[PDB]
Amino acid sequence: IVGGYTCGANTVPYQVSLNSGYHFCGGSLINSQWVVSAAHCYKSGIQVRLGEDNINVVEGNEQFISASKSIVHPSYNSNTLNNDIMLIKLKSAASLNSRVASISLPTSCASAGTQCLISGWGNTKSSGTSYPDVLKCLKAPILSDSSCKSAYPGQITSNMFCAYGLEGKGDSCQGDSGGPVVCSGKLQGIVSWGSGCQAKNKPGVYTKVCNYVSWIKQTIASN
Numbered sequence: 777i778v779g780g781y782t783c784g785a786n787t788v789p790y791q792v793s794l795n796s797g798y799h800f801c802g803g804s805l806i807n808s809q810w811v812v813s814a815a816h817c818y819k820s821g822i823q824v825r826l827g828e829d830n831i832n833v834v835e836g837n838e839q840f841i842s843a844s845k846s847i848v849h850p851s852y853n854s855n856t857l858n859n860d861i862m863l864i865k866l867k868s869a870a871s872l873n874s875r876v877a878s879i880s881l882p883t884s885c886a887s888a889g890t891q892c893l894i895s896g897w898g899n900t901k902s903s904g905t906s907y908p909d910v911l912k913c914l915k916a917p918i919l920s921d922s923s924c925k926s927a928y929p930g931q932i933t934s935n936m937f938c939a940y941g942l943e944g945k946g947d948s949c950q951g952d953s954g955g956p957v958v959c960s961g962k963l964q965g966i967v968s969w970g971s972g973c974q975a976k977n978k979p980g981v982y983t984k985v986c987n988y989v990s991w992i993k994q995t996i997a998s999n
């Protein structure tokens with residue numbers, strides 16, 4: 777997260793870190809057994825880390841639980857990033873508490889102009905590289921679809937939305953991928969792609985979670 781703020785420990789209790797020997801992506805806890813992330817975060821050998829603030833220090837509220845299965849959306853296209861969503865099942869249910877909590881799925885799609893909360897452990901520089909240890913947060917508005925399409929001609933599908941996010945937060949960044957975009961208390965986006973982090977005229981692009989609620993529900997009912 778570039779241009780954001782320190783969230784505060786466990787203030788984003790649905791935020792997870794995906795670890796394969798190192799943090800590589802975020803995700804969102806949607807119930808005690810399932811995490812939503814980006815399909816482009818897929819790999820084998822995932823450990824889900826819940827209850828994190830500093831990802832480099834064991835602080836006493838963590839739960840580390842290996843994934844038993846990952847399910848990439850059936851129509852994910854890694855070239856275009858269309859349908860950039862995956863589900864990760866935990867080998868054992870998380871213990872839900874004040875520091876480890878699920879986020880609701882949306883009933884309706886969010887509105888242009890709504891301020892959302894984006895979070896993660898990704899790069900905090902637009903130019904160059906610096907990785908935080910504690911969870912970072914950004915408040916960012918959803919942009920109009922016409923604004924989003926003008927920023928990325930020929931690339932924005934109905935399964936994506938943009939969120940300065942045009943002037944350049946100056947955004948989400950490498951290592952935030954897969955993490956949440958929460959608007960009005962619902963998981964509305966997944967950190968997906970953009971051009972750099974320009975953080976002029978290149979806001980972040982996010983998977984539009986409201987399009988996937990049926991798939992999520994049906995998948996978790998059978999797996």
Ligand SMILES: [Ca+2]
Pocket residue numbers: 828829830831832833834835838
């Ligand atoms: Ca920790």
